[PDB]
């Protein structure tokens, strides 16, 4: 293991990750990424019609 | 949907009103959510696959 600062195996994310649970994935929304797709979209309606 | 809502309800298809109801189901997505059974015949399933 090379690893320097942080434990061995251990490689890390800035995203989380959680595991799939199927191997015949669908369209599905409830995600960090989705979320944050959702509310910069909510922040420019308040603008538009502010 | 409206071509298939018409449609579907003259075929001999027993499980014809699941996926009359799952036709809508898929469109609306994301827009408007339900509870389904299990992670596999999820909400974003093809319509025809029920």
Redesign the interface.
Known sequence: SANLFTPPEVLLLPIDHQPA??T?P????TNELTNWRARVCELMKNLVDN | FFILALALPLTTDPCAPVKAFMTLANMMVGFETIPMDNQIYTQSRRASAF
């Open positions: 649970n199927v015949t669908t369209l599905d929304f």
